[PDB]
């Protein structure tokens, strides 16, 4: 299922991911693609940060879902 990432500077990165993905697996996707090491990534969806061991599954995220992207190192 195909997401959105958008940054602080209004980049807006289209990240294709498994539902079983864990948030740390999907930090390393947005790495391949952007290069942005996963250790200075926030992910935040649902008016939370995403904690790296659950899965995209565990916050029901869905095809076409946002999630917002904050520097954090
Ligand atoms: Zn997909
Ligand atoms: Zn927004």
Redesign the pocket.
């Given at each position: 299922?195909?997401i959105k990432v958008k940054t602080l500077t209004g980049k807006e990165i289209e990240i294709?991911?498994?539902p079983t993905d864990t948030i740390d697996r999907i930090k390393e996707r947005v790495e391949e693609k952007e290069g942005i090491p996963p250790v200075q990534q926030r992910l935040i969806y649902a008016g939370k940060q995403l904690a790296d061991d659950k899965t995209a599954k565990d916050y029901n995220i869905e095809?076409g879902s946002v999630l917002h992207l904050v520097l954090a190192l």
């Open positions: 299922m195909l294709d991911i498994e095809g």
